[PDB]
């Protein structure tokens, strides 16, 4: 529709025509922080506009409240915005209080043109149809979804817009039915924003190994939650790695050689920086398969290394210093053993990068380091604002870690990733030991009232780490029905729970159609009925924060609602 996958080039040419000059800064990029894919997309975008010498500004934004703040203080000189990683799922034209007759210029002719473009780079679905069809200013980059799927909804939208008698009543009732069946779909991410920008770079001819690595990184960040999308996009990344890889073979390792490979990248947590033992131990998938949160699962992991013939001391060596023969042989050892434990999906081919002699890093490890920097890198409303400012400031640590000139900062990210995952694991074993999960009929509920690490889980990404750890543990059990989950943690300073509504998912190795997050609109509907003072301004609208006293009324109304 607005800009299809075939015509991102026209949008980029328009950006240069409108908003490039030696004279003035004219382009503003709003990027949702606490989103790796949006970060990588903005990095690629900023390198493009660096090479093309477009004077531009990047603002990292936490949520919709900060969006409407910052948008309200943009000068008329700013005639293009790029909204990266948010804004598709909401009527931005209404939300930002746009009037096209307040933005129109040079209409002459049956024609219109405007003093500010607002381009939207978002992978979230369902699209708000006022962005896609209603607005003449909001300009969404589409993966193909609108043309592939939304023909009936397009028809219904335009006819209901035109349809201002019994036939008339039946028609407007019908198209209201279509649009209210399209809305009240659960939320879901269908693409990587970074691969979307990579398709733009492919259309311009700007592809190179830096931009390909950023595409790989932003795409790899989807792998935990949105494995089906990652499996859609992985073959195209293989094609581009082969296309850009240089032609020399049996190449001698040299200080200048950046080599980006497809090779075995196991589903283990930070293998090349953890010990081998810790890389099994702190992996979400390994914990799910082995039930590692208890002593019997720990015994099973020891049993595994014993049957592999690996001494436990060797397994606990830091991977650089771990025995070279074991590292050369590790693929064979895994092949010969991991089917016996059901861990055969540990085997995977993923993207590994090495730059001269300073050692290999996979896209898996790199996105873990970047998330760690986002999470922990550095009157109640004021304290909340200061907290959100800390998270905005963490964005630039992840940003700077994307540059090879600052690999010490990436190493900080690696260390913080290990310690974060340790905190996740300890809180997780607390939940599963003490059985904090309550099996309500429609969804599973978990509420963290007290304990250590509670001051971490006020960050949305760290809460989602614990959620994903728990959900991997649930998915790999045939005992449990695949119910949606609510996970909450109190902030004892603000006196508000942070609450996350989480999808289930099928076990990791199996293949079906994706299952959608309907906590987003369910939370909206309860928020619309209730007197409770809940906030819903986070970009990932299935995450909210709610005052402590309001939680039990809220969850009671949630479980009495039929929306889940």
């Amino acid at each position: 529709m607005y800009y299809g996958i075939s015509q991102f080039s026209e949008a980029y040419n328009k950006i240069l025509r409108n908003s490039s000059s030696h004279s003035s800064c004219q382009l503003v990029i709003f990027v949702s922080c606490l989103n790796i894919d949006a970060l990588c997309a903005t990095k690629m975008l900023s390198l493009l506009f660096k090479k093309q010498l477009v004077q531009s500004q990047i603002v990292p934004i936490f949520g919709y409240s900060e969006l409407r703040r910052h948008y309200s203080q943009l000068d008329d000189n700013i005639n293009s915005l790029l909204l990266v990683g948010f804004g598709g799922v909401i009527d931005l034209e209404a939300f930002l209080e746009i009037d096209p007759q307040e933005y129109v210029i040079d209409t002459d002719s049956g024609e219109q043109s405007f003093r500010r473009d607002i381009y939207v780079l978002d992978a979230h679905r369902p699209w708000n149809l006022d962005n896609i069809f209603g607005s003449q200013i909001i300009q969404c980059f589409d993966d193909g979804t609108v043309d592939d799927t939304l023909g009936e909804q397009k028809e219904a939208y335009y006819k209901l817009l035109e349809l201002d008698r019994k036939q008339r009543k039946k028609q407007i009732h019908e198209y209201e039915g279509v649009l209210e069946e399209y809305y009240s779909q659960g939320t879901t991410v269908v693409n990587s924003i970074s691969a979307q920008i990579y398709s733009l770079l492919s259309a311009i001819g700007e592809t190179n190994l830096s931009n390909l690595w950023l595409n790989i990184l932003g795409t790899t960040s989807l792998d935990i939650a949105y494995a089906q999308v990652y499996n859609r996009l992985y073959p195209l990344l293989q094609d581009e790695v082969k296309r850009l890889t240089p032609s020399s073979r049996n190449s001698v390792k040299t200080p200048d050689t950046l080599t980006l490979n497809i090779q075995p990248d196991y589903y283990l947590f930070l293998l090349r920086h953890s010990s081998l033992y810790d890389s099994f131990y702190y992996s979400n998938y390994v914990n799910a398969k082995l039930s590692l949160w208890n002593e019997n699962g720990k015994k099973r992991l020891h049993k595994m290394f014993a049957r592999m013939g690996i001494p436990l001391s060797t397994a606990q060596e830091t991977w650089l210093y771990m025995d070279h023969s074991i590292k050369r042989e590790l693929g064979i050892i895994f092949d010969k053993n991991l089917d016996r434990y059901g861990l055969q999906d540990i085997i995977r081919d993923g993207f590994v990068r090495t730059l001269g002699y300073r050692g290999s890093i996979s896209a898996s490890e790199f996105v873990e380091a970047l998330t760690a920097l986002l999470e922990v890198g550095n009157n109640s409303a004021q304290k909340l604002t200061n907290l959100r400012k800390r998270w905005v400031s963490n964005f630039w640590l992840s940003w700077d870690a994307l540059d090879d000139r600052k690999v010490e900062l990436l190493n900080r990210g690696i260390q913080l990733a290990q310690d974060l995952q340790r905190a996740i694991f300890n809180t997780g074993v607390a939940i599963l030991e003490k059985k904090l999960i309550k099996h309500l009929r429609i969804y599973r509920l978990c509420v963290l009232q007290d304990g250590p690490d509670l001051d971490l889980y006020r960050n949305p990404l760290t809460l989602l780490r614990l959620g994903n750890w728990l959900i991997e543990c649930c998915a790999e059990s045939e005992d449990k029905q695949l119910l949606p989950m609510v996970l909450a943690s109190i902030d004892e300073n603000t006196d508000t729970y942070l609450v996350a509504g989480l999808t289930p998912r099928y076990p990791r190795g199996l293949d079906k159609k994706p299952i959608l997050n309907n906590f987003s609109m369910a939370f909206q509907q309860i928020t619309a009925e209730t007197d409770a003072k809940v906030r819903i301004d986070n970009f990932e609208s299935s995450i909210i924060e709610i005052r402590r006293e309001d939680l039990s009324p809220f969850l009671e109304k949630l479980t009495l609602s039929g929306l889940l």
């Binding site: 060596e317 830091t318 210093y321 002699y357 050692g359």
Partner: protein, 190 residues
């Protein structure tokens, strides 16, 4: 044997001369900077040695008591090549190792760690005086005055049992004027 030793030495010479990070040849620079202030040693980070060529680290960690002397020899050759004009003297350089390998606590070290590189920690409770150990003995036969010399590396040595062509039952003595010595100190770690 000395063909393989020559190849090991050449591999280490290449590690010093080629290893580079962010446009700086850190080991060439460190070796030169050490030579100027007249400390004849080199501090090597084994992360860098692993990153350069893990086969070299495999040789070193398999048998450090044979490989460390060859690495020291390589450092001497590079030291001369970067501080003395080729065709217009230095002692044998000490190799110092930095490591981040997993520590073994002092009480766990046992028979499986013999001849391995080991990392540990503790408190030094005592420090002895500087004893003198030979790096190079000038030697001669007590009877026929056959003269030779023995180079020594301190990783586990003796005089020869009988003369290298009668000279009697135990024939060799040291010549201390042309022999060379180094400081050796004992520490007790608790």
């Amino acid at each position: 044997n000395d063909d393989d030793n020559t190849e090991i030495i050449k591999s280490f010479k290449n590690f010093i001369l080629e290893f580079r990070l962010d446009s700086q040849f850190i080991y060439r620079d460190q070796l030169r900077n050490n030579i100027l202030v007249k400390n004849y040693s080199l501090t090597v980070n084994m992360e860098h040695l692993i990153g350069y060529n893990e086969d070299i680290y495999k040789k070193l960690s398999d048998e450090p008591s044979d490989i460390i002397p060859l690495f020291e020899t390589a450092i001497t050759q590079v030291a001369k090549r970067i501080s003395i004009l080729s065709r217009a003297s230095l002692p044998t350089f000490q190799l110092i190792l930095n490591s981040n390998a997993n520590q073994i606590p002092l009480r766990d070290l046992d028979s499986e760690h013999v001849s391995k590189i080991v990392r540990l920690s503790g408190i030094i409770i005592s420090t002895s005086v500087l004893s003198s150990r030979a790096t190079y003995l000038s030697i001669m036969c007590r009877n026929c005055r056959h003269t030779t010399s023995i180079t020594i590396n301190n990783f586990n040595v003796s005089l020869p049992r009988s003369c290298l062509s009668n000279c009697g039952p135990d024939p060799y003595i040291i010549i201390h004027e042309s022999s060379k010595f180094i400081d050796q100190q004992f520490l007790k770690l608790q």
